[PDB]
Amino acid sequence: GGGPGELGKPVRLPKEMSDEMKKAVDDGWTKNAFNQYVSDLISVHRTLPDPRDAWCKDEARYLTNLPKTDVIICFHNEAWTVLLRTVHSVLDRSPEHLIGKIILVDDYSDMPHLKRQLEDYFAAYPKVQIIRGQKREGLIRARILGANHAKSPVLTYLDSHCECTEGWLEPLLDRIARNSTTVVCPVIDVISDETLEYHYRDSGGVNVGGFDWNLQFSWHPVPERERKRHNSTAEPVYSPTMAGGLFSIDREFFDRLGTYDSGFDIWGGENLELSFKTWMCGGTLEIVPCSHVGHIFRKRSPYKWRNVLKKNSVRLAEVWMDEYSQYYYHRIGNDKGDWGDVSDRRKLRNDLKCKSFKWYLDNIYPELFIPGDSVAHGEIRNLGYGGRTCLDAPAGKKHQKKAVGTYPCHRQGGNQYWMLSKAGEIRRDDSCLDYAGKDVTLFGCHGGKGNQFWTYRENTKQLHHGTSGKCLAISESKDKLLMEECSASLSRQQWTLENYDSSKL
Ligand SMILES: O=c1ccn([C@@H]2O[C@H](COP(=O)(O)OP(=O)(O)O)[C@@H](O)[C@H]2O)c(=O)[nH]1
Ligand SMILES: *[C@@H]1O[C@H](CO)[C@@H](O)[C@H](O)[C@H]1NC(C)=O
Ligand SMILES: [Mn+2]
Known part of the structure; x- marks a missing residue:
């Protein structure tokens, strides 16, 4: 029994x-x-x-x-x-x-x-x-x-x-x-x-x-x-x-x-x-x-709380991440806060004679996409209707099957942090912007280009979708993010991408 x-x-x-x-x-x-x-x-x-x-x-x-x-x-x-x-x-x-x-x-x-x-x-x-x-x-x-x-x-x-x-x-x-x-x-x-x-x-x-x-x-x-x-x-x-x-x-x-x-x-x-x-x-x-x-596995933890992982994450980066620490700080708006005294850990690292973090990325984890290699990384700003509207959405597997939206620019990163890859991805970590004829969505980068493929047209400042041939734009209410026919004269179709570098192409 x-x-x-x-x-x-x-x-x-x-x-x-x-x-x-x-x-x-x-x-x-x-x-x-x-x-x-x-x-x-x-x-x-x-x-x-x-x-x-x-x-x-x-x-x-x-x-x-x-x-x-x-x-x-x-x-x-x-x-x-x-x-x-x-x-x-x-x-x-x-x-x-x-x-x-x-x-x-x-x-x-x-x-x-x-x-x-x-x-x-x-x-x-x-x-x-x-x-x-x-x-x-x-x-x-x-x-x-x-x-x-x-x-x-x-x-x-x-x-x-x-x-x-x-x-x-x-x-x-x-x-x-x-x-x-x-x-x-x-x-x-x-x-x-x-x-x-x-x-x-x-x-x-x-x-x-x-x-x-x-x-x-x-x-x-x-x-x-x-x-x-x-x-x-x-x-x-x-x-x-x-x-x-x-x-x-x-x-x-x-x-x-x-x-x-x-x-x-x-x-x-x-x-x-x-x-x-x-x-x-x-x-x-x-x-x-x-x-x-x-x-x-639980959907939530029922523990007393005593943004907030920021302290532990900044010490981890200050000590262990060498020059790559800057990429974590961009995602948190460079509001590093006060991580406390961290001297003990720097001595510990030196006494053990550990390898550099570049060595770690280069040899152990080279598949990882480094935001500094992207054509651009940071906020994606729409010049229309004031020019104070930004591409803004959360990433993850819960916020899949959500339309990506717009929100006023706070130079704080997070949800308004994006990278434009050499492979035409507009991405955050393993999530990619995607358009299949209904709404723009954030879900998992599959590396196959197609509906996850975008072009930033430098002279016109448009974000162009390869398969649908349409251009990315925001509405009059600034609340929604939509796809429409490409028109060079339309300001709602213009974008500036932080850290644009033509040579990464
Ligand atoms: O203040 C706490 C709260 C959590 N736990 C324990 O730590 C383990 C791992 O925590 P949790 O499962 O909540 O983390 P998760 O796996 O969900 O990421 C569990 O056995 C908890 O009982 C703990 O030791 N101290
Ligand atoms: C033992 O541990 C790992 C596994 O390869 C490696 O770092 C180390 O060089 C190994 N070899 C010796 C001789 O300990
Ligand atoms: Mn657990």
């Missing part, structure tokens, strides 16, 4: 339900930003399907002597059944002799079930130790507390809403056992927040980590330069950056790299910091397609 959710199948609550049941379902969504009521019906030892490729069972060989790892799971107000299932998943699917301590770091959670109730439950489980923080300090400082209580040669981090799968630990530990400067992440699969269903995929469609120039992590598929390094797609692949929070690193190597920046605030790109340090200071970062961990 496996129960609800056995083998990763979804769980759906009745269509019509009593009121007390409704209150509890909503109670669960309010507290956790997933459906706790569903999670509570699912076994804490919920069985899962084997997501590993044929290659991972048959043709992959791992060294016989692997380093003992500690597992650090930070949490704050995590749900009972969810936290337990993460811990029970490590114990049940990891070879006993490879787990030293399962360290649960508390970070000043206040819900009763994580206090004494957790202590009594894991009393029977000797490898589980509970460290309690004295005040809410956030993820970054908590992982550092866990690394201080850990004595095993290797650290492995997991969120409190994860599920390890069959064979998850050996392929990660194998990479470190070959070479200790190697940081590794499992493939991070999706557990539905609504049904807790488990979703895994072919090692063909594996994504490797990069970043947008707002210093946010972002996924991209494995570059061909990398795929050509491998006889099979299930071998470990280089990844210029980690998503963060699920990874394994050598404990002393973690220490040597300065762990996380002590001066970061909660809103941190510590994941980006650790990634750059690993590459630039004698290590490598790998995604191991043979290792799958499920994670409960």
Whole structure:
């Protein structure tokens, strides 16, 4: 008898339900930003399907002597059944002799079930130790507390809403056992927040980590330069950056790299910091397609707030990004703010004798588009009806299927930051302007030109669409961004593009 959710199948609550049941379902969504009521019906030892490729069972060989790892799971107000299932998943699917301590770091959670109730439950489980923080300090400082209580040669981090799968630990530990400067992440699969269903995929469609120039992590598929390094797609692949929070690193190597920046605030790109340090200071970062961990992805985080990631992102750039720091500052309007004292980190970098950031981009992440190489980058200004209207929209996968609009120019960047590429893209990060006969849209650059292809006609100042033959323009209300027949005499069809350089063409 496996129960609800056995083998990763979804769980759906009745269509019509009593009121007390409704209150509890909503109670669960309010507290956790997933459906706790569903999670509570699912076994804490919920069985899962084997997501590993044929290659991972048959043709992959791992060294016989692997380093003992500690597992650090930070949490704050995590749900009972969810936290337990993460811990029970490590114990049940990891070879006993490879787990030293399962360290649960508390970070000043206040819900009763994580206090004494957790202590009594894991009393029977000797490898589980509970460290309690004295005040809410956030993820970054908590992982550092866990690394201080850990004595095993290797650290492995997991969120409190994860599920390890069959064979998850050996392929990660194998990479470190070959070479200790190697940081590794499992493939991070999706557990539905609504049904807790488990979703895994072919090692063909594996994504490797990069970043947008707002210093946010972002996924991209494995570059061909990398795929050509491998006889099979299930071998470990280089990844210029980690998503963060699920990874394994050598404990002393973690220490040597300065762990996380002590001066970061909660809103941190510590994941980006650790990634750059690993590459630039004698290590490598790998995604191991043979290792799958499920994670409960949430649409929002229900945490107290204490723009705002700006401090952590500027320290990351002031220390680690050399001349390329300027490209982050453009996106935030050069309002760098006050990132605090950062001297300790500059000394740390010099003592380790790390490579330059250009080296990182040139050798590890050369696929990344550098805004300085574009024909123009900055705001896109329309000269019509006052000349104080700018191309303005948000990017991302939620703001796909939105029409791109217009808004008054604030020289602050962000939503009015764009690059005109040599390949005729008007873009922000991996998003491209696109026109297929209804509205102008921002979605994902496919690199095929066509409807994502534009021409800036220097003498006329028009933005010309190759396939529709139309010209880009703004309406009289200045609220909408439309396509119309090209007329040289129309001011609503004129644009000036910041940093236009003819020679980048
Ligand atoms: O102040 C906090 C809030 C979050 N968490 C924990 O940090 C882990 C990762 O956080 P989260 O899942 O919210 O980040 P995400 O994966 O959504 O980016 C989770 O186990 C949380 O319980 C924490 O340690 N301190
Ligand atoms: C070990 O770690 C990485 C993997 O290639 C690399 O930086 C380093 O040169 C490797 N070699 C040695 C001798 O440690
Ligand atoms: Mn998470």
